[PDB]
Amino acid sequence: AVVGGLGGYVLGSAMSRPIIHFGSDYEDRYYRENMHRYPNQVYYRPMDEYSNQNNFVHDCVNITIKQHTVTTTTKGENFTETDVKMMERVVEQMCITQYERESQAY
Amino acid sequence: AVVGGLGGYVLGSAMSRPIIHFGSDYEDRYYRENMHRYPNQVYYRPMDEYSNQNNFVHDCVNITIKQHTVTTTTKGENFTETDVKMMERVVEQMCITQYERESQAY
Numbered sequence: 001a002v003v004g005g006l007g008g009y010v011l012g013s014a015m016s017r018p019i020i021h022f023g024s025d026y027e028d029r030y031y032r033e034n035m036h037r038y039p040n041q042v043y044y045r046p047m048d049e050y051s052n053q054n055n056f057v058h059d060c061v062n063i064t065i066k067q068h069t070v071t072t073t074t075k076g077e078n079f080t081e082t083d084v085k086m087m088e089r090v091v092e093q094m095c096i097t098q099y100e101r102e103s104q105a106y
Numbered sequence: 107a108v109v110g111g112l113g114g115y116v117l118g119s120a121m122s123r124p125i126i127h128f129g130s131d132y133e134d135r136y137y138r139e140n141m142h143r144y145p146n147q148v149y150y151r152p153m154d155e156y157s158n159q160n161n162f163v164h165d166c167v168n169i170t171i172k173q174h175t176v177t178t179t180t181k182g183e184n185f186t187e188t189d190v191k192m193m194e195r196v197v198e199q200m201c202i203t204q205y206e207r208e209s210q211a212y
């Protein structure tokens with residue numbers, strides 16, 4: 001799963017994901033709980049090619065996220081405690097409905 | 107991607123994911139925003155095999171979630187507006203760090 005025109009991009013080394021503080025309590029908790037689903041390294045082009053930080057960082061952010069997006073994974077890889085708790089509730093309701101579907105039609 | 111011992115399980119038809127109301131504002135919003143990452147149909151065994159709803163629903167919930175978990179997808183398939191906003195912020199910080207890594211060592 002390689003995004004187009006990745007040639008001449010280099011993958012840097014892992015780093016620690018920044019801890020960010022958004023105002024909202026939702027964003028803060030969401031970020032803690034989900035930050036591991038995001039990249040911990042970026043793609044970039046050689047410095048000998050840039051005139052400033054801004055351009056460097058434009059290509060790096062764009063391509064890093066595109067590339068991270070095309071990457072395959074299992075749905076289960078992504079889920080968290082929260083997802084898990086939430087599927088158990090909704091999948092239970094749905095199985096009760098399937099049950100009713102089966103009793104009525106049977 | 108088939109979980110073991112799926113034989114004799116049947117996949118029911120899609121339904122509308124229930125809308126659930128948890129007390130917490132986090133859970134409620136999280137669920138709206140994420141409910142589409144969860145199944146909209148379940149696996150189950152023939153009714154002629156059960157003595158009650160509870161057993162039917164035990165197998166159905168367990169296997170449906172296991173099976174949903176092993177299912178492949180792209181990381182980008184999973185992301186939402188929120189994930190996207192969040193990656194743009196963290197991937198920007200990281201690209202700034204990679205930048206500093208490159209300026210110092212260069």
Ligand SMILES: [Cl-]
Nearest residue numbers: 011012013207
């Ligand atoms: Cl590096």
Ligand SMILES: [Cl-]
Nearest residue numbers: 101117118119
């Ligand atoms: Cl059905």
